[PDB]
């Protein structure tokens, strides 16, 4: 559609014009929110500069390179139908090109000698976001909304999504969330009574909102709801608030969920930039889902004490499996929701005949009565650490029980053993009415 | 009726706890001439329950927890699940001992443990008044001990070997510690106006002159090295009732709290003194330096600041005009809350031996600002007098001018 046309400023621009070897000596000015927004834009300019520069590097000395003449790949890429890449002309000039495809691959031109693509150019999100955001500036200066912003600092199962689903007016408000799985979950839980009230217009991912701004749908919203806003750059949040034209915005955040990550070699994102500036701070410290033992765990990972309404106390247990093969639906059926930490293990369990299997990451925000967590990879698994957000999420999905089957000792095994050892009278101290 | 408590985690050290209690009871009866009761308290944090300890009056783990309710002291984060459990029990123990100390005769407390149990016991034990026997046979007595003892009279007896059963070694170590404790207990049962002063080597000329004056004026004195724990030590003694007046000459700890030095005070500095409403004469001694050491350690941002190398282990940083105003703000914000007489004495010439004419830290521009900033911030304080004297903090006349000011708000 007209999207590629909306990105004309990027089409055929020289690779050089988009590469900025610096963005480390940048000095920001104005109100804190303004610097955060500016910095957010810069983080995008920086990410794109790295993507374009890496493509040029590959051409001169995942990463796929196409030979225009033979229409055959010199180095096939992992992905397909890349949204863009860098073109190397016969004179050896480098340009950024918005890519078009057909039955035989990339539609090229006469002067094009080679084309380079990568995972970074699979989607043109940075360009899309940069296009949208710069259009909102008046000489590099972003407008700050006068809307009131309320931050709700919460913990697993305290009611972050629940409150949003309970307080939102679907005919007037907007709910923005970080990922597609979150959005689909929100829309699914809102529509669970039989009527579709949550659509693609009042519940969107942040990326979708930013990339298709103005493009249509609806612009003016009375109230904005952001679920899991600490997963976003502060400038991004200031932008969303302003772009939604809301009078008030409620940002629900969790300090121990996967946080916003730089991911750009020594890119400047100082501490005071990472702190969201808001008008009011509310705290939620009573988990309505988690058993007492998991609550104890939450107490050691969060600022402030965490209480629970649940009567459940001891709920976790583990099992070291001598033979990885023995983990099959016939030998040992896993009750409740079956989860794994990695995609590979997930595939393994599915290939063995286990039903409805997902990764911890794929079920964020979800609740289950019973959970069977499985680890089949004896080799090192990065995301399984005592301080990992994944471990946190994996321990807080169940209301009744959780059991961890693993082929090798790991931090989760220790955490679970520890929780099993805690005094029951101590666990009672976390109980609260309701 | 005097009572002592033998405390430990019975789920992992039951026999050692018993052996100790047995030896304490035996020693108490032995050393006295006259009856001291002994109660065994279990502070285990696991689910393993202990219902008794021989024939001793015994308090189970759950009973200690039941008198406590989660508070701010344990709301933060912790390294692991066990650390949190211990943190909560520790504070619960503190409540349990508070109760026993009010509506009962607490004669002393003793315990044993590794780093964990010691950490658990120390916190609750040091919450009791100085004088009351506090003893812990610890496996970590030899090493860094300040986080356990703090400013208290808590005594850590080295266990020598790891506490793991009664053997020829632990038998002797536990017997000695238990006898020592019993001695302190029986000995206690069967048996002037003091001024506190803050000091630094760079203000010792002032402090020594003030001390000689005070002793001559008939006072008893306690000098504290302003290293961060010093001010805290002084203040804990103030609420303990051991200090009736304070001459806070060296407030240098404020510089470190503000700038971020190594010998910093905490946000509570001065509160103890003001809450007691005891006479307070305060000054700006050594507020011209923030402590670091060694240079290689000096945080990156201050690496370009004016540094003075005292030793290989300590390097002093000269405070800037801008930082001095912040020092004044901290002091003033506290003093303006006073509900009793306070006098601020300021030496116009300099605040330390290094802040004098012809010395490495001399900067009358910073001194002047510190002075004018205190005056301004304290101008509407109807409880505080501000005196600006034409001297250097170490000049004999300044010292005697300090005691003069003290005498007027604390006549004798
Ligand atoms: N389908 C359901 N039926 C009954 N109770 C539910 C259901 N879904 C969620 N809950 C309860 O709602 C509470 C969780 O509210 P949520 O907002 O979904 O969790 P949260 O505060 O968002 O924390 P996260 O996102 O899971 S880390 C828990 O008490 C769940 O037991
Ligand atoms: N996971 C846990 N949860 C709750 N309590 C625990 C846990 N693990 C251990 N404890 C208890 O913590 C207390 C101290 O354990 P100890 O083995 O005695 O540690 P310690 O010898 O005093 O010091 P260190 O750190 O082991 S040298 C005992 O009551 C244990 O049962
Ligand atoms: Cs163009
Ligand atoms: Cs450029
Ligand atoms: Cs199942
Ligand atoms: Cs006797
Ligand atoms: Cs005797
Ligand atoms: Cs209680
Ligand atoms: Cs200092
Ligand atoms: Cs005054
Ligand atoms: Mg949620
Ligand atoms: Mg906490």
Curated annotation (Swiss-Prot), chain A:
Binding site for ATP: 157-162, 189, 288-289, 397, 418-421
Effect caused by changing residue 300 to D/K: Overcome tomato Tm-1-mediated resistance (AC A7M6E7) thus leading to increased infectivity in resistant tomato plants
Domain (+)RNA virus helicase C-terminal residue range list: 285-434
Superkingdom of this protein's organism: Viruses
Ranges for region Helicase: 151-406
(+)RNA virus helicase ATP-binding domain segment(s): 122-284
Record's function text: Is a methyltransferase active in RNA capping and an RNA helicase. Methyltransferase displays a cytoplasmic capping enzyme activity. This function is necessary since all viral RNAs are synthesized in the cytoplasm, and host capping enzymes are restricted to the nucleus. Helicase region probably exhibits NTPase and RNA unwinding activities (Potential). It also acts as a suppressor of RNA-mediated gene silencing, also known as post-transcriptional gene silencing (PTGS), a mechanism of plant viral defense that limits the accumulation of viral RNAs.
Protein name: Replicase small subunit
Native organism taxonomy: Viruses, Riboviria, Orthornavirae, Kitrinoviricota, Alsuviricetes
Range of the intact protein held here: 670 to 1113 of 1616
UniProtKB/Swiss-Prot annotation, chain B:
Region of interest (N-terminal inhibitory domain NN), ranges: 1-191
Record-level GO BP terms: defense response to virus; modulation by host of viral RNA genome replication
Gene inactivation effect: Increased sensitivity to tobamoviruses (ToMV,TMV).
Extra information: Transgenic tobacco plants expressing Tm-1 exhibit resistance to tobacco mild green mosaic virus (TMGMV) and pepper mild mottle virus (PMMoV), tobamoviruses that cannot multiply in tomato.
Family that this chain belongs to: Belongs to the UPF0261 family.
Subunit record text: Homodimer.
Protein's name in the database: ToMV resistance protein Tm-1(GCR237)
Source organism (scientific name): Solanum lycopersicum (Tomato)
